[PDB]
């Protein structure tokens, strides 16, 4: 259950990207688009 979390965290550059990007989502620094799927 932890392997995927650890994969995302194992490289500090990816961990920093995720931390900043989660903060951006939670603080309202975002870009919204319509995507046809």
């Amino acid at each position: 259950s932890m392997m995927e979390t650890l994969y995302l965290q194992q490289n500090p550059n990816n961990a920093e990207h995720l931390a900043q990007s989660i903060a951006d989502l939670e603080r309202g620094k975002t870009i919204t688009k319509d995507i046809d799927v």
Partner: protein, 87 residues
């Protein structure tokens, strides 16, 4: 379906990179988005996983061997934190 998708700035830059360089990657990301919308955060393609640690509140699906779609869903609205691994 037409989905209204919110991206983090970094995820949006990476999605644009794929639009410009790897249309098959875009197609796969979009199939994952279709599945999240149709079946919810935890159900469907890409081996969905509830993330732990300080990623709690978010989920991962596998785009390919290295890239993960990291996202959450609030009131049926999909928010993308990441769609590409930052090495």
């Amino acid at each position: 379906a037409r989905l209204n998708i919110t991206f983090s700035p970094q995820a949006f830059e990476d999605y644009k990179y794929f639009q410009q360089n790897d249309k098959k990657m875009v197609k796969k990301i979009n199939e994952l988005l279709k599945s999240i919308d149709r079946n919810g955060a935890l159900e469907g393609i890409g081996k969905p996983e509830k993330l732990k640690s300080n990623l709690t509140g978010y989920y991962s699906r596998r785009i390919n061997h290295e890239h993960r779609l990291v996202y959450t869903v609030d009131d049926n609205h999909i928010k993308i934190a990441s769609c590409k691994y930052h090495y």
